Design a binder for this molecule. Structure first.
Ligand SMILES: CCCCCCCC/C=C\CCCCCCCC(=O)OC[C@H](COP(=O)(O)OCC[N+](C)(C)C)OC(=O)CCCCCCC/C=C\CCCCCCCC
Ligand SMILES: CCCCCCCCCCCCCCCCCC(=O)OC[C@H](COP(=O)(O)OC[C@H](N)C(=O)O)OC(=O)CCCCCCCCCCCCCCCCC
Ligand SMILES: CC(C)CCC[C@@H](C)[C@H]1CC[C@H]2[C@@H]3CC=C4C[C@@H](OC(=O)CCC(=O)O)CC[C@]4(C)[C@H]3CC[C@]12C
Ligand SMILES: CC(C)CCC[C@@H](C)[C@H]1CC[C@H]2[C@@H]3CC=C4C[C@@H](OC(=O)CCC(=O)O)CC[C@]4(C)[C@H]3CC[C@]12C
Ligand SMILES: CCCCCCCCCCCCCCCCCCOC[C@@H](O)COP(=O)(O)OCC[N+](C)(C)C
Ligand SMILES: CCCCCCCCCCCCCCCCCCOC[C@@H](O)COP(=O)(O)OCC[N+](C)(C)C
Ligand SMILES: CCCCCCCCCCCCCCCCCCOC[C@@H](O)COP(=O)(O)OCC[N+](C)(C)C
Ligand SMILES: CCCCCCCCCCCCCCCCCCOC[C@@H](O)COP(=O)(O)OCC[N+](C)(C)C
Ligand SMILES: CCCCCCCCCCCCCCCCCCOC[C@@H](O)COP(=O)(O)OCC[N+](C)(C)C
Ligand SMILES: *[C@@H]1O[C@H](CO)[C@@H](O[C@@H]2O[C@H](CO)[C@@H](O)[C@H](O)[C@H]2NC(C)=O)[C@H](O)[C@H]1NC(C)=O
Ligand SMILES: *[C@@H]1O[C@H](CO)[C@@H](O[C@@H]2O[C@H](CO)[C@@H](O)[C@H](O)[C@H]2NC(C)=O)[C@H](O)[C@H]1NC(C)=O
Ligand SMILES: Nc1nc2ccc(OC(F)(F)F)cc2s1
Ligand SMILES: *[C@@H]1O[C@H](CO)[C@@H](O)[C@H](O)[C@H]1NC(C)=O
Ligand SMILES: *[C@@H]1O[C@H](CO)[C@@H](O)[C@H](O)[C@H]1NC(C)=O
Ligand SMILES: *[C@@H]1O[C@H](CO)[C@@H](O)[C@H](O)[C@H]1NC(C)=O
Ligand SMILES: *[C@@H]1O[C@H](CO)[C@@H](O)[C@H](O)[C@H]1NC(C)=O
Lengths: 1273, 173, 119
């Protein structure tokens, strides 16, 4: 009630004391509506004039017992002070106490503090400040001390409950203030300056609304406990597997066969210190910092002649890439899980150990990197969705008019809007035609067209303004930005290379007519609208990380530079200044954190760099994931209501097309009128017989076997086929027989089904096309025209034979049906993506067209300093003198819009982006030699692109595809769309294991000793003892490392033997206690198998290590010990549910894996046929190439995760000399030339990654669905 | 690429035969300076007599009557790093039947290291008057034809049986 | 590199003096490349006389004005290049310098000590 505004006076204090006495005699929740920091309820009405900011009697009766008063601030915000004497000296009625209170409650105080904080945050970005930047810091400390004392006097220090130190944000503020003055009294500078960065966190306290969402993030992280435990346990198990398999394998090196001066390996080793001396005894590839790895197997890296493979030296990458110890193995497994530069570890491990070890990487990538990531992603979505539901529920609870009318009628008509839309489309198309080597006539044409288009747009601007005037004109959002853009274009015409690219933003006018572009605009608007606070918190966190990194490691990056760059100058990615620190932080957010952290370690210590990088990665990824899921769910759920009718007032484009179709109908009718005025029994039984035969299971199985054989016979066409002279001819005749069989099968399909029932079927059309290609090739070969240009090139289409299995295998057929169903929305989103990326491609063309050229020394491939050879004329003058000098260009660049699209793809997938970025930031001009970081702030272009065209775009696509798959499932009627009919019932049967009721306790033995043993073995104490024993065994396994002494080996062996005997004893006890009931429990039979396998492995490793000599077999069979630590799952209710979800999801993942394997097989055959002879450079190697089916499959599995695809594509973009030799002779084969085909390479390597991306999103759908099912039911 | 394709072992009298000797290095990116020597032990003889030597892009033929004016180089050309060391007989007679030997002397050039290695490849050549057909081709063609006829017969038998059953059932109906 | 030396060093006469000269360089000191120049000058503008040097091993040139009273007392491995002395008469008063060059570090250092002999 309004009357309830009495003051806090002597009588009020007396009443409060009486109520406290009443509460003491008596010896609940306070009113939420009157909680401090919230708006005043509307019941109380307007605050009386003279009572603003005055100590008022408590407005909540809950506090009527205690001594507390309320002060009301303009804006209806309730501040709850404390009535107890402040500091025990002052009291609420005091000349100073009231003043301090009103000061703290006022706004200007808050604005002043925020301004000071944000000025300090600008001064924190100076790596070395001038000497005068001490008065400013003194001013800042003075302002902070004044604020602290004001708060002290306003609300007491620690006297009562409502005081200074109650608020957690006060603990940070006071802990800073004390450090500042304490440090000044003291006067490691780096640590003292780092402690100043805590002043940035006060932004969260001052800026309204950031505190609540920081609390929301802290509450959301608490849901990721089970997931984190499972992740740590899985990474530990995989790290143990890796530490067992590849212990010391990365220390392999090629050592000289012949030495001199009686030098042995140890003598040589104990002298070398520098790389120029290491290079004299080990094989180093040109321009490599690490000795070439080798292996002792038949499928490992091979050393040159005169070099022998030995295990000695240090591990690659400064020594940080190793499996020798558990810590390094865990780091490597975390890197594999996060899929950061994992292809390098993949290649190193395969070269060192053997190519048959890619199974380990397959399992790790498809079990830990793609599944444990989905559990984290799924859990946060469930945690956010629960929060959002609660928020929704809580919310629920004279001459001028003559021209004016004429112009309005002229311009405000449907036709003009469509004309302007076509004008926008044509202007963008015209702008897309720019390229580097552009002749003067083409440049003039482009300039004239741009002038015409800007003139048209300015004309319509003036026409519309004069039509409706600027009072009514400036009320429309589209009109505002249209005016902005035309003004900018006029400014550019009157006057650089950026303002010309601002007309590209007119493409967003098509959002009105384009429903799925309005979704992108809505996402962008939400990111700075409803979720603007979350975006601001992300920005603040990134700024804090950049400042912390700079303060910690900037001095070291400069002092220890020669440890990371042999030129003793800073590398490309460092932390010596704020811009580069921020770039490193942004790169870590993008997902590349190991290459930039190796140098961090080398310069400034492993502990510090690891702590900082782990904090940055975890917290930044948490915030980015929260923002992504918030945007996704909010934007794609807000419109579900259909709150507004579909185009109530039809859009001008819609009206224009309506008029156009009406006119077309009128014209058609008039023209039609004018022209009309002016002027068997046996055959049917045979058909039935063929139907019977072709519908038979025997026939289907025979044809499936033939399909498998004919597809497998394609894998024998390696480059080594000429050595296999018998297999050659065997496969030729087998191909002929397969063609005959499939011709007969197609003829029977005809004679059975009919020319309509057969040719109205897509599977039948596919089979018909394949067999027709085979028949055409066979006829041409038989007639003698086998090598006839396009006829010969047609033979390469035999890689499509495996496609015949989709129609035969129901598992793949079901998933193919889902993809075919989802295609339309995919196409819509791809269209929006292409339009959005066209803008950035054009802008990149305008910024970087032709500026990627450079004059390089072809021996070491090093750019010449710009002091000499500063331009292309001087590069050619130097060419005429020297010989190994080239004016080279990047193969992927921004010379035109197509290559811009390719470069943007490489940037958005983060693979070639560094190579492109270095050239972009070095670019000077056209025909000018690049200078180092001449254009340093070009990094902002790539930052802004990686945000807009690779985060919001991915958000839009994910939302669209999720909605489409939900719609498909709803159409099927709540049926899983990735499971076959047979797998559905097995899935349902498996589901029951998650809801079984507990079974009756096993009856006790009827024997005097057996009963006691049962009672002992059926105890929680026994279970806990076994669990701790398993943990101790795990620790014993972890304590093992490479280079350990024989005593350590012996003690570890004996400890493991003791553990084995203890577990066998527990097995025996459980046997004699539970009798035959024992084997009715699945976990107990698992324990039995684990125990027996541990004993067998222990007894068999001795045989493999005493008579037989097979280290690989010994290492593989020693993996049976991990079955002892896998038993930790049994007592973990938390992770058992998640592994059950995985087991339930397996049936759907099997089909997708089968389809992915089929696609990989097809692409492997195509790669074998096409890229078998390209020049070996960049990512194509002696081991990783397309010379053989195994190598092709290795490369394709690698690039399935989108890793190194730029490196595999680069050697194929060479198609002219001197890059490739078109007439190179390959010994043992008739093929000539090691050149690649750029178009085929681009198509291959783009289509494959797109298809793999679609399959990967299919897997996340399956995993998310199963996780939700298991979590709910 | 580099594939060590084994040489053929059958030459037809009067025609031209190419004797194959390919030697690929373990790592293709290394540098080398190779040269070769060929030795021939005619059938009925027990001594390997050197017949030619090739080095620095010049073939030095020995004064052998059996090979005078009947040998030309068919190896790697235009380089000192030879990996193909074949030779060509432009007119094959009966004196070219026997065991051959292709010596390869490869000298790798490493960083502060030089390795002088050597290889030997043995080729046995028999001269005939007519070119015999490959037994693998014979068996492959015969197997293909028998399999084709077997499949056709089996399908026809199944068609006949199914049609007779269908006609019997139809007449029953 | 930064070099930490005392600006003033007061040593009583008839007592053994020691000159603290320490420097911090991120790179492990290599004895095959370290260059060191101990020089003495009577004043700031006076000529500097070299009396101790490290090219590959500690070599003392035994200048007559110092006799054999100069001894090395530091350890480059631990980055201590201090020089200790035997008892003195007031003539030793002056300025002592320790120039240090620790490759591959680029910059060169110099630490100055103004030795004083008390009665
Ligand atoms: C919220 C925030 C959460 C994140 C909190 C921070 C989490 C992690 C702790 C990091 C700090 C502890 C690291 C201290 C390690 C240390 O100072 O120890 C040294 C040893 C290596 O010593 P060495 O001489 O054998 O190698 C010498 C190699 N050479 C030849 C180059 C000289 O370091 C080793 O063992 C390797 C160290 C690997 C440690 C695991 C890193 C991966 C962690 C993932 C956690 C999940 C996220
Ligand atoms: C990374 C992986 C690291 C290794 C993981 C562990 C491998 C071995 C696991 C044990 C194998 C024998 C299991 C025998 C039957 C055990 C059993 O009771 O099964 C059923 C249990 C069910 O658990 P829940 O907590 O009731 O489930 C959630 C509720 N709703 O659910 C389970 O125990 C099923 C677990 C299946 C194994 C995990 C998936 C493998 C693929
Ligand atoms: C920008 C130029 C130089 C290159 C690309 C050509 C454009 C002229 C095309 C590309 C995609 C087209 C859009 C794709 C689809 C639509 C939705 C369409 O809405 C419908 O009525 C169709 C309903 C539906 O199927 O979703 C209106 C036109 C529009 C925006 C199209 C307008 C013309 C666009 C922008
Ligand atoms: C919002 C849309 C319209 C643009 C998205 C990309 C931007 C991040 C790009 C467009 C133009 C770019 C600018 C174009 C020109 C330059 C000059 C460049 O420096 C030089 O060219 C060197 C000059 C010299 O040293 O003489 C530094 C970056 C900067 C500001 C670029 C920063 C990144 C910008 C703003
Ligand atoms: C999902 C699908 C995953 C793709 C997996 C396809 C397997 C693709 C094949 O994997 C690669 C290796 O296993 C085979 O290459 P090797 O050279 O090791 O062959 C044997 C060599 N020795 C040891 C006999 C000499
Ligand atoms: C769907 C269709 C998928 C095809 C299914 C079939 C399996 C397809 C997998 O086939 C594997 C082998 O045929 C590969 O051949 P190799 O590289 O081993 O050839 C050399 C072997 N020898 C001759 C040296 C021993
Ligand atoms: C270079 C040349 C590249 C050639 C590309 C070849 C593309 C072929 C991809 C496969 C293209 C897919 O095959 C077509 C069928 O999938 C379409 O028919 P449905 O699957 O809808 O049939 C109904 C399914 N049920 C209901 C019977 C189960
Ligand atoms: C990528 C991840 C791949 C790993 C997944 C392993 C799955 C391995 C476990 O598969 C789960 C089975 O229930 C489904 O496999 P089937 O297709 O054999 O069962 C259904 C049989 N019909 C329906 C075809 C007759
Ligand atoms: C899912 C399917 C999506 C497939 C996307 C296809 C993207 C690639 C299409 C264009 C990929 C091919 O584009 C043609 C250009 O690359 C031509 O390149 P050049 O001008 O160097 O000439 C090469 C000729 N030799
Ligand atoms: C291109 O680089 C090569 C190799 O660095 C230069 O050739 C030799 O380089 C070494 C240093 O590594 C010099 O000591 C030699 O004197 C160089 N050999 C010469 C000049 O024959 C080469 O100079 C570079 N190209 C140009 C045009 O300078
Ligand atoms: C590499 O080895 C070959 C073969 O042993 C050497 O050639 C022989 O050299 C000796 C003289 O040192 C001659 O007497 C032999 O007649 C040569 N035999 C042949 C087949 O050439 C060759 O000298 C060695 N090369 C180097 C650079 O040491
Ligand atoms: N354009 C793109 N093709 C692919 C294929 C796989 C993939 O795995 C990842 F983990 F990165 F999502 C990402 C991408 S992006
Ligand atoms: C063996 O070493 C001695 C020096 O200890 C040296 O004189 C001699 O030449 C060496 N012999 C060989 C074969 O290296
Ligand atoms: C290029 O080099 C040749 C040979 O050194 C010289 O004769 C000729 O004049 C040069 N041409 C130009 C255009 O510099
Ligand atoms: C072949 O060898 C015989 C001796 O056995 C000789 O008489 C004859 O001339 C030789 N022919 C040729 C072409 O070398
Ligand atoms: C080989 O030489 C003989 C004898 O001179 C001659 O009859 C024959 O035509 C020659 N064959 C060829 C292919 O030159």
């Amino acid at each position: 009630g309004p009357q309830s505004f009495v003051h806090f006076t002597k009588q009020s204090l007396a009443l409060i004391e009486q109520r406290i006495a009443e509460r003491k005699s008596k010896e609940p929740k306070p009113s939420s509506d009157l909680e401090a920091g919230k708006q005043l309820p509307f019941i109380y009405g307007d605050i009386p004039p003279g009572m603003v900011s005055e100590p008022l009697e408590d407005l909540d009766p809950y506090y009527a017992d205690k001594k507390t008063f309320i002060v009301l601030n303009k804006g209806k915000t309730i501040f709850r002070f404390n009535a107890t004497p402040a500091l025990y000296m002052l009291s609420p009625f005091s000349p100073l106490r009231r003043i301090s209170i009103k000061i703290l409650v006022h706004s200007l105080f808050s604005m002043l503090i925020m301004c000071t904080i944000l000025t300090n945050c600008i001064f924190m970005t100076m790596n070395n400040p001038p000497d005068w930047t001490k008065n400013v810091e003194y001013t800042f400390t003075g302002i902070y001390t004044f604020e602290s004392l004001v708060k002290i006097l306003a609300r007491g220090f620690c006297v009562g409950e409502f005081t200074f130190l109650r608020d957690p944000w006060n603990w940070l503020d006071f802990v800073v203030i004390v450090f500042a003055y304490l440090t000044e009294f003291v006067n490691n500078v780096s640590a003292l300056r780092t402690f100043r960065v805590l002043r940035a966190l006060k932004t969260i306290s001052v800026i309204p609304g950031l505190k609540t969402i920081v609390g929301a993030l802290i509450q959301s992280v608490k849901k990721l406990s089970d997931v984190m435990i499972l992740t740590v346990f899985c990474l530990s198990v995989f790290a143990l597997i890796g530490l067992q398999l590849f212990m010391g394998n990365l220390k392999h090196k090629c050592f000289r066969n012949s030495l001199e001066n009686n030098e042995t390996l140890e003598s040589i080793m104990n002298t070398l210190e520098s790389e120029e001396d290491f290079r004299k005894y080990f094989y180093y590839l040109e321009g490599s910092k690490d000795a070439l790895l080798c292996g002792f197997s038949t499928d490992s890296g091979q050393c040159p002649e005169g070099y022998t493979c030995v295990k000695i030296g240090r591990n690659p990458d400064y020594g940080y890439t190793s499996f020798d110890t558990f810590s390094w193995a865990f780091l490597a497994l975390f890197r594999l899980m996060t899929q950061d530069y994992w292809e390098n570890l993949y290649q190193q491990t395969l070269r060192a150990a053997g190519k048959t070890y890619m199974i380990f990487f397959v399992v790790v990538i498809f079990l830990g990197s793609f599944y444990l990531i989905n559990l984290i992603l799924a859990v946060v979505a469930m945690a956010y969705e629960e929060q959002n539901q609660a928020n929704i529920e809580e919310a629920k609870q004279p001459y001028w008019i003559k021209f004016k009318k004429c112009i309005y009628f002229i311009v405000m008509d449907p036709f003009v809007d469509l004309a302007i839309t076509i004008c926008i489309v044509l202007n963008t198309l015209f702008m897309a035609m720019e390229h580097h080597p552009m002749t003067e006539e083409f440049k003039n044409v482009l300039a004239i067209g741009n002038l015409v288009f800007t003139g048209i747009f300015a004309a319509e601007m003036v026409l519309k303004l004069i039509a409706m005037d600027p009072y009514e004109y400036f009320q429309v959002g589209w009109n505002i930005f249209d005016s902005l853009i035309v003004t900018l274009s006029l400014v550019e015409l009157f006057l650089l290379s950026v303002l010309r690219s601002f007309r590209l933003l007119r493409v967003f006018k098509l959002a009105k007519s384009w429903p799925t572009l309005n979704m992108l605009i809505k996402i962008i608007g939400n990111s700075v609208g409803a979720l603007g606070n979350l975006t601001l918190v992300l920005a603040i966190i990134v700024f804090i990380f950049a400042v912390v990194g700079m303060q910690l490691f900037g001095k070291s990056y400069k002092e220890c530079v020669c440890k990371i760059n042999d030129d003793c100058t800073l590398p490309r990615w460092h932390m010596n200044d704020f811009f580069h620190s921020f770039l490193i932080v942004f790169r870590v957010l993008c997902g590349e954190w190991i290459e930039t952290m190796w140098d961090c370690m080398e310069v400034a210590g492993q502990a510090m760099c690891l702590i900082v990088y782990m904090m940055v990665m975890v917290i930044g990824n948490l915030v980015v994931l929260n923002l992504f899921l918030a945007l996704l769910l909010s934007s794609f759920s807000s419109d579900n209501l259909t709150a507004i009718e579909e185009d109530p007032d039809a859009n001008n484009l819609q009206i224009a097309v309506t008029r156009i179709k009406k006119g077309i109908n009128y014209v058609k009718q008039t023209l039609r009128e004018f022209i009309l005025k002016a002027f068997g029994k046996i055959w049917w039984n045979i058909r039935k017989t063929c139907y019977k035969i072709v519908e038979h299971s025997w026939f289907e199985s025979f044809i499936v076997l033939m399909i498998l054989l004919s597809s497998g016979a394609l894998a024998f066409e390696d480059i080594y086929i000429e050595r296999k002279k018998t297999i050659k001819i065997i496969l030729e005749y087998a191909d002929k027989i397969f063609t005959y069989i499939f011709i007969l099968e197609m003829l029977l399909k005809w004679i059975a089904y009919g020319y309509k029932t057969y040719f109205t079927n897509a599977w039948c059309w596919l089979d018909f096309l394949i067999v027709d290609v085979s028949l055409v090739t066979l006829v041409a070969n038989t007639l003698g025209y086998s090598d006839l240009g396009p006829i010969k090139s047609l033979r390469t289409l035999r890689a499509l034979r495996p496609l015949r299995a989709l129609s035969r295998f129901e598992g793949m057929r079901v998933v193919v049906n889902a993809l075919i169903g989802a295609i339309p929305s995919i196409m819509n989103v791809l269209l929006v993506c292409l339009i959005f990326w066209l803008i950035f491609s054009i802008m990149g063309v305008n910024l970087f067209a032709g500026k990627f050229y450079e004059c390089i020394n072809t021996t070491d491939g090093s750019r010449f300093p710009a002091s000499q050879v500063p331009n292309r004329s001087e590069c050619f003058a130097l060419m005429n003198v020297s010989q190994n000098v080239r004016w080279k260009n990047l193969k992927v660049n921004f010379d035109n819009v197509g290559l811009g699209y390719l470069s943007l793809l490489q940037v958005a997938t983060f693979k070639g982006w560094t190579i492109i970025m270095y050239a972009a930031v070095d670019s000077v001009n056209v025909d000018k030699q690049p200078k180092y970081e001449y254009s340093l702030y070009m990094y902002i272009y790539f930052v802004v692109f990686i945000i807009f065209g690779s985060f919001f775009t991915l958000n839009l696509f994910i939302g669209v595809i999720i909605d489409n798959f939900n719609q498909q499932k709803k159409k099927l009627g709540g049926q899983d769309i990735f499971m076959t009919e047979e797998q559905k019932k097995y899935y349902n049967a498996m589901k029951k294991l998650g809801s079984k009721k507990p079974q009756k306790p096993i009856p006790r033995p009827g024997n005097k000793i057996q009963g006691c043993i049962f009672d002992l073995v059926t105890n929680q104490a026994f279970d806990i003892s076994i669990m701790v024993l398993i943990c101790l065994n795990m620790v014993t396994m972890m304590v093992e490392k490479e280079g350990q002494s024989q005593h350590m080996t012996e003690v570890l062996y004996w400890i493991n033997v003791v553990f084995i005997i203890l577990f066998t004893g527990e097995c025996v006890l459980k046997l004699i206690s539970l009798r035959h009931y024992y084997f009715t429990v699945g976990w107990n039979i698992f324990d039995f198998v684990v125990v027996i396998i541990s004993i067998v492995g222990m007894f068999l490793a001795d045989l493999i290590e005493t008579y037989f000599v097979s280290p690989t077999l010994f290492r593989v069979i020693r993996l049976a010990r991990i079955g002892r630590i896998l038993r930790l799952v049994k007592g973990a209710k938390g992770i058992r549910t998640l592994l059950f979800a995985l087991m339930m999801s397996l049936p759907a993942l099997f089909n997708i894996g089968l389809l992915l394997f089929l696609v990989m097989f097809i692409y492997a055959i195509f790669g074998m046929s096409n890229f078998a002879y390209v020049k070996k450079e960049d990512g194509i190697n002696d081991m990783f190439n397309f010379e053989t089916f195994g190598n092709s499959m290795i490369c394709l599995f690698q690039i399935t995760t989108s890793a190194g695809w730029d490196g595999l594509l680069a050697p194929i973009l060479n198609s002219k000399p001197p890059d490739c030799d078109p007439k190179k002779v390959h010994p043992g084969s008739s093929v000539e030339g090691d050149c690649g085909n750029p178009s085929v390479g681009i198509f291959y390597f783009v289509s494959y990654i797109i298809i793999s991306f679609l399959v990967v999103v299919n897997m996340y759908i399956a995993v998310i669905l199963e996780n939700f099912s298991v979590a709910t039911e | 690429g580099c594939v060590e394709v084994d040489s053929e072992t059958e030459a037809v009298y009067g025609m031209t035969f190419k004797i194959l000797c390919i030697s690929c290095k373990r790592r293709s990116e290394t540098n080398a300076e190779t040269f070769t020597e060929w030795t021939f032990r005619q059938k009925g003889t027990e001594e390997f007599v050197k017949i030619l030597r090739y080095e620095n892009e010049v073939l030095q033929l020995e004064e052998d009557e059996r090979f005078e004016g009947r040998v030309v180089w068919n190896g790697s050309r235009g380089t000192k790093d030879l990996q193909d060391l074949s030779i060509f007989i432009t007119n094959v007679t009966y004196n070219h039947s026997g065991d051959y030997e292709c010596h390869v002397y490869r000298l790798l050039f490493f960083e502060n290291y030089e390795h002088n290695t050597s290889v030997v490849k043995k080729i046995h050549i028999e001269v005939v008057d007519k070119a015999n057909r490959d037994m693998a081709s014979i068996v492959s063609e015969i197997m293909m034809y028998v399999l084709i006829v077997v499949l056709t017969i089996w399908l026809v038998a199944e068609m006949i049986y199914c049609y007779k059953k269908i006609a019997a059932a139809t007449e029953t109906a | 590199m930064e070099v930490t030396v005392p600006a003033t060093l007061n040593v009583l006469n008839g007592s053994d003096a020691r000159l603290p000269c320490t420097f911090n360089s991120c790179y492990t000191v290599n004895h095959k490349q370290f260059s060191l120049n101990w020089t003495y000058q009577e004043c700031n503008n006076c000529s500097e006389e070299m009396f101790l040097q490290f090219r590959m091993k500690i070599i003392n040139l035994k200048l007559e004005r110092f006799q054999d009273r100069v001894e090395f007392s530091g350890n480059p491995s631990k980055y201590d290049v201090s020089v200790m002395l035997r008892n003195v008469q007031p003539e030793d008063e002056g300025i002592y310098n320790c120039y240090i060059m620790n490759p591959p570090d680029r910059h060169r250092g110099h630490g100055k000590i103004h030795l004083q002999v008390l009665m």
